[PDB]
Design a protein around this ligand. Structure first.
Ligand SMILES: [Cl-]
Ligand SMILES: [Cl-]
Lengths: 218, 211
């Protein structure tokens, strides 16, 4: 039951410090060093530094000497990393990870916290149904989620009850807004007699939308 | 400041093949460690102290090496093994990783299933118009999608997105979205998305407002 629980996605504006947290459970917190690792697309994995929770001794990668501050709260078995004066270079997934007691390896990892450093405005998506035109063994429908910021959105089909035959495509950023889409394929006799609905949530804008895919007609 | 250099950057192989990837260190290291990162999850320890398999790692994985030259071998690759693999050194601080080898899978060539979708009524009320095409379950990854409006190629305003390789069937899927103004959409008739690789293209089209 060894776990590291990381905080949710953060949006911060440039210059505004960000603090992320990593709650340990299922082990004796003070006995193990906690490390932090940065991951950006194209830039692999970068070690930020490490902290000994027993007496808060820390060591940082010189690359991050003026950027990252590592602390622990022994009473709540939580490690924190704070990033001073963030820039877009600080946008990344940050992992906390515990080092093995005996060996030089990382033996448990958190799920990562995605940090976006941007001056862009939080914006709600528009969710649009994709139905085929007027008029095979199967039919493909879709859902276009256009124009949101920041990530993420979550998208399901029929509340999660339709999970096979789905491709949800990674978002793409264009001019400060993201767009994502999803396809679902069902037997040709399934729809439109059985309803198919796209459910989209964008937590940042407190957006939750259900969009029924309706057949097109004259 | 031990720099780890991994090669190749990207590779692919059929299931059953033996694959080897290398990690060269700028100065001598005592041991090499190897981490596996499947798309969308955290890195996981695969091999520690050069050749010892981590708990639960199957026998197809091995690690070897010494000094400045190390390698990871997968003997009889499996479809599930698609991941980026990183070496890592703990000989000197700062701790460093290599830039990774992204390993993907080969399978039989497969044509995409292509579906085209006109702008929704909802989007048209906002004054915008997106045309979407899905190219689903194809192989290899490097497919070309081409849009045509009244038979002229349109390159401007096209947004493409690929899924990670499917971990079960080794296909890719992609979504292509062409965004126009409503005004521009309403002054043209035919919309076409065409998928090509090597020979006959797969073409899906519709004519605006012809129901
Ligand atoms: Cl905001
Ligand atoms: Cl947009």
């Amino acid at each position: 039951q060894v776990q590291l629980q990381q905080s949710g996605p953060e949006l911060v504006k440039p210059g505004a410090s960000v603090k992320i947290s990593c709650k340990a459970s299922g082990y004796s917190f003070n006995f193990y060093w906690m490390h932090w690792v940065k991951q950006r697309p194209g830039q692999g994995l970068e070690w930020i530094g490490m902290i000994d929770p027993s007496e808060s001794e820390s060591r940082l990668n010189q690359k991050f000497k003026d950027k990252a501050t590592l602390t622990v709260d022994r009473s709540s078995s939580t490690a924190h990393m704070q990033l001073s004066s963030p820039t877009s270079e600080d946008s990344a997934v940050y992992y906390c990870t515990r080092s093995n007691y005996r060996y030089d390896y990382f033996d448990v990892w958190g799920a990562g916290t995605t940090v976006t450093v941007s001056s862009a405005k939080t914006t709600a998506p528009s969710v649009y149904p994709l139905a085929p035109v007027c008029g095979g063994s199967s039919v493909t429908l879709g859902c276009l989620v256009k124009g949101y910021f920041p990530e993420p959105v979550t998208l399901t089909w029929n509340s999660g009850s339709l999970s096979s035959g789905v491709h949800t495509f990674p978002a793409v950023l264009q001019s400060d807004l993201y767009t994502l889409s999803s396809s679902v394929t069902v037997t040709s006799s399934t729809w439109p007699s059985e309803s198919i609905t796209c459910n989209v949530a964008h937590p940042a804008s407190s957006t939750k939308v259900d969009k029924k895919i309706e057949p097109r007609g004259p | 400041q031990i720099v780890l250099t991994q090669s190749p950057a990207i590779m692919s192989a059929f299931p059953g093949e033996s694959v080897t990837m290398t990690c060269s260190a700028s100065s001598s290291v005592s041991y090499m460690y190897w981490y596996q990162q499947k798309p969308g999850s955290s890195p996981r320890l695969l091999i520690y102290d050069t050749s010892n398999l981590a708990s639960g790692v199957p026998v197809r994985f091995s690690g070897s090496g010494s000094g400045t030259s190390y390698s990871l071998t997968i003997n009889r690759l499996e479809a599930e093994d698609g991941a980026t693999y990183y070496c890592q050194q703990w000989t000197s601080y700062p701790l460093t990783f290599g830039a990774g080898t992204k390993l993907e899978l080969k399978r039989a060539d497969a044509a995409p299933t292509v579906s085209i979708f006109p702008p929704s009524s909802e989007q048209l009320t906002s004054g915008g118009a997106s045309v979407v095409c899905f190219l689903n379950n194809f192989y290899p990854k490097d497919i070309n999608v081409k849009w045509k409006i009244d038979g002229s190629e349109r390159q401007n305003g096209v947004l493409n997105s690929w899924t990670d390789q499917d971990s079960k069937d080794s296909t890719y899927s992609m979504s292509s979205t062409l965004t126009l103004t409503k005004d521009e959409y309403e002054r043209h008739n035919s919309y076409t998305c065409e998928a090509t690789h090597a020979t006959s293209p797969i073409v899906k089209s519709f004519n605006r407002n012809e129901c």
